[PDB]
Amino acid sequence: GDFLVHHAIALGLHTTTLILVKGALDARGSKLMPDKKDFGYSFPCDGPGRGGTCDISAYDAFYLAVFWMLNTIGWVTFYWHWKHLTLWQGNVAQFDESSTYLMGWLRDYLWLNSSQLINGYNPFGMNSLSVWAWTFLFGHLIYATGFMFLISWRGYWQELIETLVWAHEKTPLANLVYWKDKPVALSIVQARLVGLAHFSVGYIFTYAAFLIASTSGRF
Amino acid sequence: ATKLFPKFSQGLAQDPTTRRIWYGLAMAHDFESHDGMTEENLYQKIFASHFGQLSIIFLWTSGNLFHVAWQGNFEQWVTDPVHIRPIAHAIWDPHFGQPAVEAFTRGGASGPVNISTSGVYQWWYTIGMRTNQDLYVGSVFLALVSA
Amino acid sequence: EVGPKRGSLVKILRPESYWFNQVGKVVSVDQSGVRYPVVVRFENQNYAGVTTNNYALDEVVAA
Amino acid sequence: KKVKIAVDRNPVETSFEKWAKPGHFSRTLSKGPNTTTWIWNLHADAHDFDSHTSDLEEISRKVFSAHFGQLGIIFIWLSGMYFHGARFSNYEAWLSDPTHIKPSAQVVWPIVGQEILNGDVGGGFQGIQITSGFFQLWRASGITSELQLYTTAIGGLVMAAAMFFAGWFHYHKAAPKLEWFQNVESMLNHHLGGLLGLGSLAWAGHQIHVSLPVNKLLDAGVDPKEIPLPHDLLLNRAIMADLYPSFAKGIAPFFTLNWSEYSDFLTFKGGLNPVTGGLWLSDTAHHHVAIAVLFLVAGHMYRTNWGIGHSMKEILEAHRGPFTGEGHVGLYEILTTSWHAQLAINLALFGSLSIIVAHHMYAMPPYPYLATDYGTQLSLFTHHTWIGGFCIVGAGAHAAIFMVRDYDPTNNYNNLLDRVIRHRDAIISHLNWVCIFLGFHSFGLYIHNDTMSALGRPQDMFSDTAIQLQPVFAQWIQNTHFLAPQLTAPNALAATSLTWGGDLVAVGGKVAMMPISLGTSDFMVHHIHAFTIHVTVLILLKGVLFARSSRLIPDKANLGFRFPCDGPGRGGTCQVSAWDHVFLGLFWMYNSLSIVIFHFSWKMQSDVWGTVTASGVSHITGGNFAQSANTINGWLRDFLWAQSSQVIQSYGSALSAYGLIFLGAHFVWAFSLMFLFSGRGYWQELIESIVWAHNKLKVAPAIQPRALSITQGRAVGVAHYLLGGIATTWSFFLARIISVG
Amino acid sequence: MKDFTTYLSTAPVIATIWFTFTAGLLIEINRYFPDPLVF
Amino acid sequence: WTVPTLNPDTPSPIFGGSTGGLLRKAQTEEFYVITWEAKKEQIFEMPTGGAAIMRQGPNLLKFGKKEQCLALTTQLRNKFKLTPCFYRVFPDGKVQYLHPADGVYPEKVNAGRVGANQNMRRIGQNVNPIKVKFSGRMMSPAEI
Amino acid sequence: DIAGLTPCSESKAYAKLEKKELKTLEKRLKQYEADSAPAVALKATMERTKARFANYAKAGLLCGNDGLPHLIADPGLALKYGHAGEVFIPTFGFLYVAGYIGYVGRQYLIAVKGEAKPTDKEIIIDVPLATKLAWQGAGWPLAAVQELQRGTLLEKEENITVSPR
Amino acid sequence: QAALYTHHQYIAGFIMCGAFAHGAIFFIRDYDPEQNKGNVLARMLDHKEALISHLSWVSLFLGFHTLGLYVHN
Amino acid sequence: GMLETPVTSAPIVATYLSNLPAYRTGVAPVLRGVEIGLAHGFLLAGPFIKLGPLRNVPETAEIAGSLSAAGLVLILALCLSIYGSAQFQSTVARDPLFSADGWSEFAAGFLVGGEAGVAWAYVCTQ
Amino acid sequence: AHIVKIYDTCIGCTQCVRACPLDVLEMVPWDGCKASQMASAPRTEDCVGCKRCETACPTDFLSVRVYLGSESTRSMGLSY
Amino acid sequence: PFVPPSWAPSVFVPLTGLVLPAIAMATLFVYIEKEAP
User: Fold this and answer.
1) Where are the domains of chain G?
2) Which residue of C has its CA nearest to F124?
3) Does I83 carry a binding-site annotation?
């Protein structure tokens, strides 16, 4: 099980290095964009021409690499937490026998250690572990919110904002209060950053809450 | 018209949309991209930023020391570091009802407190801290160093 | 008469070109004083779906 | 003005010459491949018939042949189900014990250890427990042997060959003209009278002559081998007269307007059969008779070749008020010339009817021993709901396609459609506001409940004990339906369904159907459903109304229906096409229907399904829906964490495959995030590096490898997301409902 | 027949026949040699 | 050739009105006015949604941005073969002629025009960003 | 023995695991008759289980504390303690088949590259040429080594497209 | 132990991504090919296709084998 | 040009909108703010009094509700003041309300009227 | 405003001007190509950055380039 | 000593949560919308 998870760790490290190294070497230009060095480090794209140039800047390579970094650290922290949990519980054979198949990781580690966490508050009352349950759901909500900025893109939002602008401008008792800044949709780069920030915050808070709650309740 | 914010980018200041605020907030530390930036001024701005970051780090450390000396149980944790849980700081939340108050009241405290997981208790106990007076003196010294 | 012969194969030396270090067939060479008189047609298209381009006299090498 | 059979002889020659030429349908793909993108295009424009040519007649003929090929595929599928039920099933054993033997119709070969999936389903058989409900349907029709199912499979194969021959004949031997396809009046008259009315009448005849006596004898305790054959019942009047005295009078009471004599097989019993748990087949037969008469009457409404009847254009033009301008002028020409508009209308009504079918089938089980099979009930409701949602999204997509391609402003000056386009901004703004209002008042209640429960304040929550929000309208409607057979339904014996109220019906120790009570949790989840439906409608309607133009891009119609963007200009115009709106509507439909099926599963397993004990009924989860469904933590712990124990420990048993799929589905879904969170520029540069590696070893293909297009990347991402999520929920529901149901 | 053979020579038909042959060979190998874990 | 003068007393196409019309920007910042000559009455598509009927002779319309006016110009030129022209109107009453700039459409070459923002080199001949660093503001290597 | 593991022929957990599998199979078999299809299928599965366990113990595999076999990936340990059949011989077998498929595909690409329309030969497979190359690929390591020695395996730097740096 | 190890590992991952991001920023903003002519830095961009290709091969091999062994188990 | 509808062009609703304090166009902004604040405080005291955390304990539910309403009124007054500060910086008849001094007087009147409305709503239940 | 530049590789095919949706590009006389015309950008203050001109350019590499600059009302294409 | 009073959290928590953020938000909002001369 340790051998297999170490190979998974090596996979995560090599893929993250691949994305980062490729983005750093292709930052000055490639065959698709021979003049990428003249556009700066961060820019939206080169337009829909030449088949499409979405996520062509080096900033976008870093952006895609953050997900792989979070996934790699997630694997290493999952391995550390499970091995030490089985060691502290006095049964290392459980980890040695269930760390070779993913069902063991999903049931014996993620499902078995979250029983006390999600029981922090229920209709029968609550205990000191309710804050970690709230943090768990908080991180899940932030992660899912990041998925919105990650999947849905600018155009739809800008058109919706234009409709809202018309609605506010044609509403009595409310058009007297006008904005000082014209409301516009978030930019592509800003959208990627916002989605990445929500993804990372939800990821970190969810794992920290689960880790502390499971380790504190078990011991 | 042109707004005062941001002061480091006249192009962003002339932006009449909400993009101006977001971009001004996200490009404040990009010293090389400001208006009228030279090499000497760039290095000086980074020097000041380094000092400000050091002050923030030291003030945060002093805050941790102060809260452990005030609401923590370091004087009692050192006598029994196996069966006593460390206390981070107290909790003052008006939203808590009666069950939350008695649920968070643990670790030998008199009110709702947070049990620390940072491990500063073991580190401070190992380096020599024994009484809360030591933590208070360390917090005052680190706050003055940050200033 | 200046430039490569019509119908021959030349290599592209322009670094920013999609067909850099690639072979292409010569179509026509302009007889004026234009900067890029050589016309080169390639079997493989670029990302924009174009197979012909105009290159300078020193931008193409016989190969 | 004359309705006739117009046709062309031998328009296309039957040959294999075009089979060897890929992409011959389009002028752009007829050149051949040069890049890998072309290959994807070859599959993306395959069925895009209005893009190959602009001739409406060619498009209509291709549509007709495509319909025949589709029906041939469906007949092959049905014949396969009947053949599997006739040779690899335990239907004969299940007929002798429909309350203990689990239905099964699939066997696996003893290879690589998969024989463990051949679980002991009962009746001396080893297979995979099916949830399609074919056993109950065959029992309802009177099928009592494998020979009948085998004969039905052979008939289905013959029908499939006939459908394929019909498609080939109508495309290469006798192709109808465009005027034949535009006879919507005659088409509607035939589909109303002939198809629906004659089909309902034929099924009523089969139910009266086969389903009713065979099922009556099955419910009377007669062994399936001793029951007379259907032709035996159809040949003599003695057996039918013994089972139903009205048959001793022949068809004489029908022609003498003495239909009351047939009150033994045509009634209003209502409720459910206490022996089987399903609806009374006498009521279904009477239902089909009434439905057949109604559809046959409706089939003589439009004029075809005689003076009597209606003209739909006349009715449409006669409907015009002061607040709508001209009215429905030009709508008839729109629907008689655009296949996409008709597809949008048909897909919307078809999906809505599919969801209605799911609700009516769990509430009023029509097949015998169907309600007691919780697996079949849950799977059928979930399946029909998903099909309805997908069809609705497709309806919105085709509405946008019609608005982009077939719309013409020269024939829509001051009609309803033009006015809708004129005030589309007001429509979208109000729908956006109602979506925000519903989202706040629907999600804030759950968040507030989670906060109050976590803060140790259960008295400040939104529950039955605390502040209650009772659905008084639904409860009053339930009471009215329960009291209907005494005042407003004097000729009805019982109510339409048991969910309204009254006594519960249980068969074989399992609750077939009991009354359903709605509380605060039901109110909250119903508002959640309304909010999700409103948001999906907002995305689809925004993509339909703003398909031609918008305040951001005034010439969107020139860019087509499916295009990635208009560049990074104007701050960014990513996903402005109507196709992207359909792409986002797919995600919202998935979210909405997932919450719908979760609510259905929890409510059924908590307050309806369960065993029957001595002086009390115990449910599967113990009735925790009225106390734990008002919080997100309750849904995550009691419904997702607790109910997923069966799918995670299924390893080593006959349900282990489900667990494997439960893991596999988590992969595909996450795989979707690779195509949804990234862009093709990075992949194109990575492909360039890989191409360099190939060029070094002289292994570079002639077809230049190009990354997936932006639209293709979005389609791949949404497809994988939907497949992963739907398969995850499918494995969880099936494993759980099979283990504890 | 030339057009039919050319159609059968396309990438999806060839891929289907080849994968069916390879899958059948692997399945028959595991059938006549059950549970091979080592050489 | 002479610059046309805007005629405010010009008939407009018969349109029932829509919600995609002008906003507060037309009264606070600027707006655009498109005028054209139609040989006969014809139903056309409005760039902001809806179908209007262009009258015979002069026709005037108001739009919020220049893109709407040029989109309608392209639609009228490619579908009905007309010659439209538009201006930018300010709240103080100033009218500025925009397209066509010289009376001749920009697709065809016309005498008197002077090329601007043209680099007498190629993309591959641009300088490195390190050479344009530490400037007055963010400057791209192609701006010089 | 190696890494504190014991052979599967002398491991108690291995025998207990075999008894557990046979016990659950026999328990499932007790609910059926003797001359029925499910009983024959269960008996066949039990015989397959017995043969699998006997073959694994006969092969000399090393089991752990969980009763499951372990593979030896070190070439020295595998060739020194009789474990070359786990990871060594299958490694060379995959190398032969992998290079076999790669060489066949490379030969087909280079052969169709000099034709008039190589893209047609790529979407529509030339079955006779592909079959001939598939049968001729048995000498792939020899042909690949001879190609590497002649310098014709790789392409020169000047004939490959690169980025503008 | 659990919280400290996880905290430091996530911080290290973010810091590593930042190191590579700043390297890309160096290539776009501060790299000078004329001053770095023939050194190790220019040779990195000289054979960048080989580096990205070999990294792709390693990642592909590791992913296929680890996922295959896990699914097989 | 624009779209006309009976909802936005009925004379009765137009006269109703003209009779509102916001559309007087000729009165002092202090009177408008006082009227708006009173009408808002009277309705604002409701939700806090009948739904706050201390709604079940007697003799203090009205106290807590009125205090929360006054706090919300104060927050709204601060928002109105900063809105007039950041909105008017330079430059029928021009309404004096849409000016820096006019909006400041309007915000002060809104605060006064809001506190009076909260106090009047509390004594109305006593 | 965005920066629109025309390079000497322009063949004067006039496709970039027709693809421009806000009338930014035009054709001026020249002596570097057979068509004796060259694209020009004298109204960059109205350019939004849709890059339709870059898509319509057939030269390798492109002759017209768009660089996103300071955003304004005309550059963001706002009708409000 | 440096020990704060018993009532210190009851005054510093509402301060840091409602007084300081409101003043900071209002000041920053006014500063962002300041028009240049």
Assistant:
1) 1-165
2) C16
3) no
